[model samples]
Target: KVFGRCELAAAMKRHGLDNYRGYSLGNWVCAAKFESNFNTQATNRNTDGSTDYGILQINSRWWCNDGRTPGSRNLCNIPCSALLSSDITASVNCAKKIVSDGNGMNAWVAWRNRCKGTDVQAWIRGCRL
Candidate 1:
């Protein structure tokens, strides 16, 4: 499923992303926008043979086990397929784990390179989160 701007923000808030780890919800919305355009089933295959999956574009290399990526650590302790659901619970939980691991939002290249240092308040303002 593809989520609209405010819709995604609202869903994110419900999943506990608001001011998570000191990063505002807008920052997460902005990165999610750029990362997968809010598409639930999004996937990206890396040149290194790892694949990125789902709304947050989690990687198979270190996060989820796709059963194909060589040396997958499966740190999220889940199958990569689980991250592609519209439910997003698995994805959100995995993302929270990502941040809690001290990687911060910098774990996402889209967050560090695009959403970071930019004013993203408007991204979530309309959602009233």
Candidate 2:
């Protein structure tokens, strides 16, 4: 499912992603915007034989278990299938873990290149945060 921008913002806020590790709500919103285009079931296979999954586009190499990436860390301790579910609880939780284990919001390449230190105000402009 592709989330409405505002809807995605609220989800991030609800999951305590706002100001997480000093990253703003808009940063998280912007990450989701570029990563998966707000699509909850988005998936992308990487050139390194791994895949990205879910709304956050978590990587199989370190985040979710896809049974394909060899000896994956699976830091999120979740199956890739769960990441694809419309229920974003697991996705939210996994993103948090990624932040902890990696480099905060910079854990997502899209966030680093597009969201970091950028004008992300529009991501949360109309949200009821």
Candidate 3:
């Protein structure tokens, strides 16, 4: 795991994710909680024959290549394993680029299904960002 939620929030804040592209820290916090529970080594094989990577659960279809998946778009040009490091700099940077591409946090199904329309502020409750 990548420390706790509070530390994750602080790191994200340091990376200017508190309000990146109009999205809130709470939004990312909530999304990360559901996506990988802040676990940097998290990986999930999707039913669509693709995989999700890292804390943000970025999909292999468009973000990174997991090797098992053939012909992946790999728009992020990173190896999926890189996203599974204790150092989340690459994951966070990739996530920012993903959101900037107009997908926002919706790129992760967790954010769309859970974080959206929820009181995400609680995700960062008591965190001194």
Q: How close is each model in CA RMSD to the real structure?
A: 1.0, 1.1, 1.2
Any runs in candidate 2 off by more than 4 Å, and if so which?
none
Model 3, 14-116: lDDT tens digits are 8888889899999988888998989998988988889898888888988887887776788888998999988888888889889999777787777899999
Q: Which ten residues in a row have the lowest lDDT in candidate 3?
A: 102-111
Global lDDT of each candidate: 0.89, 0.86, 0.86
Displacement of residue 59 (Cα, Å) in model 2 is: 0.4
What's the lDDT for residue 95 in model 2? 83
> Which candidate leads in TM-score?
1
Span of 10 residues, lowest total lDDT, candidate 1 = 120-129
Q: For residues 1-129, could you state the per-residue lDDT of candidate 2 as single tens digits? A: 889999888877887888887778898888888989999989999999999998889899988788999877787888998998877788888887788875677778888899888889888996787
Candidate 3 at 97: error in angstroms? 1.5
**What TM value does model 2 have?**
0.94
Q: Across residues 11-80, which tens digit of lDDT does each residue of candidate 1 receive?
A: 8889998788888888988988989999999999999999999989999988999899987799999999
Candidate No. with top lDDT? 1
